[PDB]
Every structure is written in C-alpha cells, then in structure tokens.
C-alpha cells in the first residue's frame with residue numbers, strides 16, 4: 181500500500197493541516213476532517229491517491245472538477261478553500277458540513293413536511309441559480325451531494341460531473357459518469373444542457389415529499405427504461421400545487437421544463453409557508469411549526 | 474473477512490475438489506484451479522461470496538447465468554461441469570482453458586495474420602451459431618471471453634450478460650451490465666436481439682486483423698458516441714474481402730447486418746486459407762504457414 185500522511189503541507193500557501201477523523205470514501209477518494217494547525221479551523225479534506233490517476237482522462241476529470249469548484253463562491257455552494265498535492269496524493273480542502281447531507285436526513289425521516297421541502301428546495305434552487313448564471317451545469321444533483329451545515333443550510337457539492345457551457349446553445353453530447361437522477365436526454369444520448377439540473381431537482385422534490393424516488397426499481401437499466409417512458413406516478417395525498425410543479429420539472433421534453441430562474445416564482449413557493457430556519461430537532465422529529473411561544 | 478475453504482464439497486454429487494492455484498478475479502468472483510480429489514481431473518472454479526449477493530437482483534443474475542450455461546454443450550463453448558453452494562459461497566465448476574483467452578494473445582501479438590484471424594473467427598462463429606439456434610444471445614462477446622484450450626481451440630465463456638429469447642421477434646429492452654463491443658441499438662436503448670452478437674464479432678474481427686478495436690478513445694462515453702455515429706475506419710492495408718465483411722457486420726442498422734448463419738459462407742472464409750490447427754508457437758511468433766516439411 182501507500183500510506184496517507186498525518187500532516188498535510190501546502191508549500192505555496194505555507195499551510196499545514198493536521199489530519200483528523202475519517203469521514204468516508206467514494207469513487208477514488210478517502211475523506212477526513214482536517215484542521216489548520218495554525219488557525220485551528222476545521223475542514224473537510226478529500227484525499228485521492230495518484231496511483232488511481234494513472235490515465236490522463238482520470239487526471240483531466242479531477243483538474244476540471246477543481247477548476248469549476250475553485251471559481252465558485254455562494255451561500256448554498258460548498259466553499260472551496262484550496263488544493264495541493266505531493267508525489268502520491270491530491271488534497272482538496274472543502275467546507276466541513278457537520279450535518280452531512282440530505283441523504284442521511286431522508287434515511288432518517290423519509291417524506292418531509294411541505295414547509296421543510298419548501299425550505300430545502302429554495303436553497304437548492306438558489307444554489308443552482310448561481311451555478312447556471314455562471315454557465316455551470318452540475319449534472320449530478322442528488323440527496324448525497326446536498327450537504328447541510330450546523331444551521332441546516334444546504335451546500336451543493338461534488339462537482340465531479342459538472343461541465344462549463346462555453347457558448348450559447350452548446351449541447352453537451354457526453355457525460356462521463358452515472359448520475360442518480362439522470363435526465364432522459366442523457367440516457368438516449370441526444371444532447372443536453374442546463375435543463376438536466378432542473379430534472380434532478382424535480383426528482384429531489386418528489387423524493388423529499390413522497391419519501392421515495394420517482395423511478396425506483398430493483399434494476400438500474402429498468403429504471404432508465406421507466407425514465408425513457410416517463411413512467412412515474414404522484415400519490416393522491418400530495419397537494420396539487422406541489423404535484424403540478426413536480427410534473428412541470430419531470431418532463432421528457434427538456435425544452436418543456438421550467439428554467440431554474442422561474443422556479444421560486446411558482447405557486448408552490450409563493451403561496452406556502454417557508455420557514456426562515458429549521459430547529460436541529462428536524463433531523464429527527466417532524467416539526468409542526470406551532471405558533472405557540 | 475470470510476475465508477474460502479481449501480476443499481469444496483458438493484453433497485448431491487458427493488464430489489470433493491481440492492482448491493489449487495489462483496487464476497484471477499473480476500466482478501464478484503475469485504477464481505482458482507480446482508482438482509477433483511478422486512478423479513484428479515482439473516477444472517476452473519469460479520467462487521463468489523454470498524456477502525456480495527445480498528440483493529435479489531444480483532442473485533437472479535447469477536441464477537440466470539448458471540441456468541443458461543448449464544444447458545449448453547458445444548465444442549466451442551466453455552464446458553459447464555457443475556455448481557453448488559454453502560452458506561457463504563457459490564461455486565461454479567468450469568472447463569479449464571490452459572491458454573487463457575484471446576485477450577492475452579492480442580496483448581502479445583497485436584494484429585494476427587489473415588489465416589489466424591480466419592481460424593479463430595470460424596470457431597467463434599460456430600460457437601455463436603450454436604448459441605443462436607438455441608435462442609441464446611451472449612451479449613458480451615469479447616477477447617477476454619473467448620478462451621483457448623491447450624490445442625488453441627476457442628471456448629466461449631462468461632454468460633453473465635446472456636439472455637434467452639422466449640418468443641419469435643422478442644426485442645430485449647434492457648441490458649444490465651456494460652459490454653465491451655457494445656452495439657448501437659443497445660446504446661440508444663431502442664431494443665435489441667441476436668444481431669448484437671454479430672456486431673461484437675465484427676469488432677473482434679477488426680481487432681484481430683488491425684490490432685486495435687474500431688471505436689477506441691480515451692473515454693468510454695466518447696467511444697459510445699463514435700459507435701452511435703458509426704465513426705470508424707479500416708486501414709488500407711486490410712484486404713478488401715476482409716474489409717467488406719467487417720463493414721457488413723459493423724453497421725448501425727441491426728437488420729442490415731448478416732445473420733450468424735450466413736457468415737462462414739462469406740468469401741473471407743470460402744476463398745482464403747483456413748489452417749486446420751495452429752502450432753503452440755502462434756501464441757508468440759507469427760506463423761508463415763510454409764509448405765516446407
């Protein structure tokens with residue numbers, strides 16, 4: 181094997197990070213809490229060994245992820261605080277999100293209450309508005325990529341499938357990777373762009389409100405077939421205003437969906453209660469939003 | 474971890490296999506030479522731990538592979554000699570192919586001579602004729618799945634993506650897995666059948682004669698795009714009769730390709746030299762097929 185160092189030094193910034201506890205691993209990366217030995221402030225470190233970056237294509241994907249993410253700064257995007265490397269590893273320094281992601285929330289709570297769905301969906305949309313106006317398509321928005329800080333604020337992360345739109349009307353023809361909430365224009369390989377992320381948000385909203393994803397089966401290719409056929413249903417207990425907005429977003433024709441900028445003007449948002457914040461108990465117990473002191 | 478036993482007992486057949494040397498691993502399986510303690514004859518054992526078969530879908534794929542393969546017996550198909558299980562593992566007993574596969578040959582020889590290509594391609598086609606007349610589509614014919622015994626005879630193996638055609642004109646809509654030489658009707662998800670294997674044979678013939686696969690790029694999705702666009706070329710040094718047959722097989726429209734039964738009647742075969750066998754040196758040195766004693 182090749183061992184990961186206990187202290188990480190960036191020679192340009194002159195900065196040292198002590199490697200703390202293990203956060204998880206996925207794709208090519210192992211992740212740890214890392215504290216700046218000097219400033220003592222804590223980060224999420226993503227460490228990827230160069231032994232798995234032997235092919236130029238895999239290196240280029242890494243370089244792109246970093247290039248896209250380093251140029252982003254927004255309240256609902258994961259803060260990018262630096263990156264550096266030695267002969268064995270690439271280290272990326274990211275904003276630590278102490279409440280993990282909406283994945284862990286969903287596992288614990290299943291369907292959320294409408295106001296909670298509204299609260300998270302608004303921050304997800306705001307994050308994505310920022311992306312899209314800077315010509316970035318995320319292309320893998322999912323529960324696992326929507327991180328939550330201490331105050332239950334959403335931070336969009338994992339730009340491993342993101343791409344920049346370089347000219348007006350550019351249709352991306354290729355997507356290297358397998359998103360979760362994957363849009364029909366991708367699956368048929370007919371060309372794709374910004375609308376891909378609105379599709380994913382539609383899936384996310386369905387999941388948050390219903391407690392299961394709209395095209396789930398026990399087989400991935402069977403699911404892609406459902407998505408091709410637009411074969412989902414919205415349970416009757418879902419409110420019509422929410423159901424309508426889901427249906428607008430989850431449409432086969434990309435050009436028929438709303439754009440990211442329209443969404444917060446939908447009646448789902450403008451005529452429903454949007455809490456200003458959620459108490460920490462919302463990780464565990466459904467909130468009833470009492471008017472009581 | 475969970476340790477694999479040194480001796481494998483099948484309680485129905487009453488048979489014991491001593492576990493010999495490690496052959497390799499891929500997907501979910503570790504593979505070893507295994508000798509029948511009684512008869513002393515040697516097999517290839519594919520051992521897959523049940524800890525990776527926790528989902529019904531993954532178990533069903535295994536059951537299907539076995540069901541398809543156990544019902545097959547042909548000179549150019551890998552012999553199926555049994556299967557059994559304990560609480561921790563499934564064990565499959567297969568014909569040992571001491572010369573590994575055409576993958577290892579290709580790595581060592583690159584482009585083969587025309588007569589060699591003819592020799593292997595004929596056995597590949599014969600194996601596939603057998604499959605197709607028993608309504609089996611292999612769906613992942615590639616160099617790595619075309620094993621060679623001591624006498625350099627081809628044995629088609631890995632039925633992990635195979636499917637049975639249950640009625641006339643059935644179009645398979647789904648393929649769980651990622652073939653190497655993947656046909657355009659699969660990639661676009663428009664429905665597919667027997668023609669898928671002829672496409673793969675076209676790719677195999679290209680590879681055997683040219684020394685590289687027809688749609689290779691440094692990115693898998695980029696390759697799928699080439700295949701969508703039928704974007705390959707045949708080098709000028711390839712003989713026109715071979716080039717013509719490749720082009721007939723490597724066509725976007727499935728219904729425009731030859732069927733497996735037509736192939737051996739192609740001029741590529743009927744008007745070229747087909748050696749009756751190849752000497753062992755053909756693993757390493759190009760043969761010149763001298764008429765000299």
Ligand SMILES: CC[C@@H]1C(=O)N(C)c2cnc(Nc3ccc(C(=O)N[C@H]4CC[C@H](N5CCN(CC6CC6)CC5)CC4)cc3OC)nc2N1C(C)C
Nearest residue numbers: 202203204211224225226258274275276277278280337338
């Ligand atoms: C860095 C990349 C990405 C990203 O881009 N950003 C921006 C990001 C930001 N912030 C975080 N935070 C946390 C992530 C995770 C945790 C955790 O508790 N992890 C635990 C998960 C279960 C593990 N257990 C399972 C049961 N095992 C026992 C066996 C019997 C069952 C023993 C081992 C132990 C570790 C805490 C966090 O915060 C304190 N993660 C991020 N990630 C990734 C980690 C997905």
Ligand SMILES: CC[C@@H]1C(=O)N(C)c2cnc(Nc3ccc(C(=O)N[C@H]4CC[C@H](N5CCN(CC6CC6)CC5)CC4)cc3OC)nc2N1C(C)C
Nearest residue numbers: 495496497504517518519551567568569570571573630631
């Ligand atoms: C069973 C499933 C499938 C199947 O369905 N059928 C029907 C089948 C039939 N027959 C075989 N035969 C053989 C397969 C393989 C070998 C070999 O030499 N393997 C070696 C490969 C390199 C490994 N090395 C690499 C360098 N490492 C050192 C480091 C520094 C580089 C050390 C470890 C050591 C083992 C020999 C065979 O025959 C004697 N395999 C089959 N397979 C699979 C194995 C693909």
Ligand SMILES: [Zn+2]
Nearest residue numbers: 399400401649
């Ligand atoms: Zn599947």
Ligand SMILES: [Zn+2]
Nearest residue numbers: 356692693694
């Ligand atoms: Zn790629």
